[PDB]
Amino acid sequence: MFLYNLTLQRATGISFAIHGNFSGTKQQEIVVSRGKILELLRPDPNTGKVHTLLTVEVFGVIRSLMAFRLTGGTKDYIVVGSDSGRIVILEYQPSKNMFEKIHQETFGKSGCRRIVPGQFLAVDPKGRAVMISAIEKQKLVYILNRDAAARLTISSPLEAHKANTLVYHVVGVDVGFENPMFACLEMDYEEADNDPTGEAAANTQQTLTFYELDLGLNHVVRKYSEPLEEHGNFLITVPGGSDGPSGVLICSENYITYKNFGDQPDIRCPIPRRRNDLDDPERGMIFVCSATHKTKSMFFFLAQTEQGDIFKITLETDEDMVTEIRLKYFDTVPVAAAMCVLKTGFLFVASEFGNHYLYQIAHLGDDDEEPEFSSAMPLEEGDTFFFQPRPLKNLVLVDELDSLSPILFCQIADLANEDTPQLYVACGRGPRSSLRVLRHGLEVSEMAVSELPGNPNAVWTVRRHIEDEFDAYIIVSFVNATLVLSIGETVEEVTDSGFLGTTPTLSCSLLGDDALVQVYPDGIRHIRADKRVNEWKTPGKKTIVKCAVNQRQVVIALTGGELVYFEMDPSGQLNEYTERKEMSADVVCMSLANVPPGEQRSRFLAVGLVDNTVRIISLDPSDCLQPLSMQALPAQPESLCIVEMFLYLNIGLQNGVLLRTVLDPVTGDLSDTRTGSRPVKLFRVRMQGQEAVLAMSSRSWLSYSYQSRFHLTPLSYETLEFASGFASEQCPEGIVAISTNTLRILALEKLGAVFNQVAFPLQYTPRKFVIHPESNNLIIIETDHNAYTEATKAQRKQQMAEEMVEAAGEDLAAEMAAAFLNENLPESIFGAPKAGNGQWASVIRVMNPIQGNTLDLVQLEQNEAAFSVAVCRFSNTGEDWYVLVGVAKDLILNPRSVAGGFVYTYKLVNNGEKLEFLHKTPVEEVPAAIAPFQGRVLIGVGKLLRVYDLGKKKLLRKCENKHIANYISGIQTIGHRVIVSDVQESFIWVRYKRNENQLIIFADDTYPRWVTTASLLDYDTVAGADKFGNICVVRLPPNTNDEVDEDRGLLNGASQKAEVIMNYHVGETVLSLQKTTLIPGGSESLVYTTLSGGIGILVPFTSHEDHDFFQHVEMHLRSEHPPLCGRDHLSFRSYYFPVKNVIDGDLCEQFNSMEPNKQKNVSEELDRTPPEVSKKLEDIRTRYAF
């Protein structure tokens, strides 16, 4: 078979973040690296949100990322080091909106090797050189200059190779227009690998080394090399030259050290720990972020410990020497990978797990109240620096940017009884863990909801002037009456607006600059602001069936379909045109384009009729009321709307189908999507400062442009009837939409994403959850290494209170122990305490997946950690449900020494809302895989697969196997077969027999995999994913008879070796595979959810013409459009195993992102036209998924 990989939700977790003037303007930008994805984010200063400006798939792993400024320069170039053996320097072109690759220099073979550089990346702060460095043996220095076209140039790479040397970090030492130096934390290990005593590797301390590039001699020399009294992990540049004391701060476990060569005495300052926080038996504390800042008077550092405690670090100095280093507890934020403090006083934190945040700095400096700390205070007894944590004081949260990393488990299910399915996702690490529900809709925020009597069939919303920023009137038309409401921000019905709609109306608008129009099927009422009613009667006894209103044009259709035009004069009154046409059938809909800013009348008019035909008619006065082009339709038209952003006519039919044509004096192409079992009604809505079109069906959809790319996304909301735009001080930009007997002022706040995230927070990192299929409820097991269960939290709290009273309380304050006891710190905010090593907190939570509330919570013991859960129903007992939970005890993870597990058995008594203990069986290794099978369960002990059955005392085994290798991690059954996933090798097919009870291995796979999870596709094939990033599909050979009864194997294994029919690299550890159908009216597609937040699909190809066309498309795009980092795309997808039968659709869907000369070249090489290629390229996505 032939697959096709699409990404629905791109990856969202951020590894690297850098900031600077990438556009070249005064405002700054963030550039983040999501591993495989390079994005540019703009932190909008007035409104505080973050807006993505560009998102590119670089098809490598960006191992390091750093921005640098050329000396005497305005733009910052981005310097990317990746798994290819190339440094690559990029420039953001804001005009074309792309990353133009300025330079690309190759220095070694590809992949995340140990010898070739790319992992560490330092740059000179002035911007004259750049050093790209490996974890071992070799470094390189490029010399960047600018030649006379103001153009960037690179020298040949200098070499700074030093054998047998580990490099912990590298950083650019500031030297103002001096020879550039780089500082690195090296370690020489050859004497540690030569001496078998084991103590020579115990006194082999790090060396801070300074490499000085001699521009006069064009080579790199080790200038200084000073050892370190403790192992530092990373360094911080200190600004210098004329700005500060040029040097390198060195962070390390429980210490921060200023070190700079020549004359400075080495300044150590111990890291302030918390007051009596209960996580430190013996554990140190390191920094994880740097965040330097230069506020044009002084400079400071926003360092952050591993719990999340941002410190503000500042150097107090004489002439150029540092006198002391002093710091204080700035704030506490969830733990970040990178911080970028922005000028204009922002602070962007990129939490590596969970949501990222953007705070506004409210009180910088913070030199007022807090007991600040210093290096030169002569304090002994370890740290003696004890700050007390507190809620936010210096920062205020402005934006929470949403993310899904890490997706640990996911289900596609329709538990909320909606038509489309839903994504139930586990997320987060630690106390910030959360179960998130995702739908395809848009987020619909109810600003206000009113009930209307009767049954309203239409609404409109108008202002008084064109210059009115907000609206002043709402018009609701019922079947036989109307009402007019007014907004004075307290919405009420009015009587003297001038409309007086006792008859139902067909429209209202603001025709004049301050003059209005009502249109009702008994006449047309021009209402000037001075309430002057220009009535116009019907001609004869025909009634007005349809209407098309504008600023300066009205066109109505009366019964039989007779068309009457009305123009707005410069006098302001309406003038009927002297030509009237009756068309070939009745008119079911009409629509006019909105009037342009300069233009004084709208040119084209589209009219849909009962012949299932829409006609386009020009209304320029040369050829008014004269046809241009017709288009036939399959069913009865219902609604038409013409917009720009390049004009498009959107046609909704009486069945739930929407179409779009391009518009000009002739009409062009056709696009279509089934919105639907309801007649589609189309309404122009102002969205995001632009135009967008709301379609109405059994579910409401919104079609809106987004960087020349329309998104037809539904709304996560009920079925409605009629809709129109809205503006107020209550809601600046929203929709007024009515459904059955009610009216709703709604707001669609998020117009970027695809899914609607709604989260319910959890206690610990949720491993996996099952779905109780009767009365749908999730049953989550949550389990975290290095974590107290809250019984021991309360015990350790009472113990520390007892110690704080007992430790010489005579002279006294037992108030300290009481206030310590009854003042909890929010662990989702301040970080959970870490319980040393080998401790294991775990809960079991039954949760309603609608409201998200803990319907039951079952704690476990101190080290008993849950690892596998299954709901099932046995055959030897009756109908009653059962919950199995695999538990372990004293697991310690490295070096791996489990102390035997258990399997808890619970009853799920009642509708499923609570969970009675039934029994507890002990097993001799951790049961990592529980799976129901033919009314019993199958339990993978780990190298031992056992059938089990219920006993009233404990679970009773029925069979056993012992020839399955290293460790079980997954058991999946198609019925009569078992697919045992080893943790190292592969899928092992096992047959279970009915006459006997044997478990016979009858097939395995030739490759080693390290399978994480897997999924069954056919009776034969098993799709699996692994730890390293790949996705394989293992289909059994066509014979492979299961009837094997029971010594040689074939190659030390089984005998019928299965075969592989795709291998593909994804770049992230794919942890959930599921065969499902994400859209009804679509077809099945393997949905994978990765670990870095991403969500993708693998869809089969129908016919060989599609497969061959897309193969030639991506085989052209590897040539014409190479990836940004230089990583070869075929040799990225063939990272571990070579690729097979999968076409990368993320490279294919970059056909819509090239310059049109390239698109014309590729498209004429494909012998098609580029709109037809883009139609064919989005047909697969809209057919299979979103």
Binding site: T106, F107, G108, K109, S110, I154, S156, E159, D1128
Partner: protein, 100 residues
Amino acid sequence: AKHHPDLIFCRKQAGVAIGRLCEKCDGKCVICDSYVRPCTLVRICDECNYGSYQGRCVICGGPGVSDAYYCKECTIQEKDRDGCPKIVNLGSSKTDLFYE
């Protein structure tokens, strides 16, 4: 070359100087000596491109005419990501033929 097994390459760190091939050597891959599918330019190091050694044939040492290239089967095997492919020594061929 692969025909003469005693020839050694420079294999130092490849700089920015683009390698050139003589009129007698035109079309050859540097590692393979095959004529088809050139894909990647040759970057020779700085000692192998200094002064009088500029614009000189990578294989020969004669005066260069065209740009040098790796074939596609050297590109996809990543034989272009080892060092400077400038053949250093002249050994046991085109020296006794000079002596004959």
